């Protein structure tokens, strides 16, 4: 048991530590897209987020990771990722939608939408007109699954 819970908490820091660097990523990109703006730098190029793409895609496709994750609110960075960009652009496809598929895949609840902010993102995908219509589609089916609870 006390074995059981040092194996729960390393599975806890492990995800805490990718939450953290999912949130380093994000802040880079961000503060290097400001220095574009500020600059018109065109060598300045924000990849953070995507270099650090297929590891945030393994660990959100493992079965077994999927209570720690949860559990850890990890989908409150998958929400910093998915918003829009100082310059005016949206993360890349790739983003979009690697994320979009493992949160269909993911058993995400109400508490964790509340305590992420996820909703709030993904409804703006729905509607935006800078987002391709196949993901406006997925973010919709996202929505339908997640309200359904509520409102059927």
């Given at each position: 048991d006390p074995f059981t819970d040092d194996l729960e908490q390393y599975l806890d820091e492990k995800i805490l530590r990718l939450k953290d660097e999912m949130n380093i990523a994000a802040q880079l990109d961000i503060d290097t897209l400001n220095?574009?703006?500020?600059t018109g730098d065109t060598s300045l190029i924000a990849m953070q987020k995507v270099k650090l793409l297929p590891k945030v895609v393994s660990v959100?496709?493992?079965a077994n990771l999927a209570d720690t994750i949860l559990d850890?609110?990890?989908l409150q960075s998958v929400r910093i990722w998915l918003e829009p960009l100082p310059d005016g652009s949206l993360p890349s496809f790739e983003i979009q939608k690697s994320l979009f598929a493992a949160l269909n895949d993911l058993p995400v609840?109400?508490?964790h939408l509340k305590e992420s902010g996820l909703?709030?993102?993904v409804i703006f995908y729905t509607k935006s007109k800078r987002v391709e219509a196949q993901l406006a589609r997925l973010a919709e089916k996202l929505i339908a699954e997640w309200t359904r609870p509520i409102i059927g």
């Open positions: 220095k574009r703006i500020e959100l496709s493992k850890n609110n990890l609840k109400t508490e909703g709030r993102v």
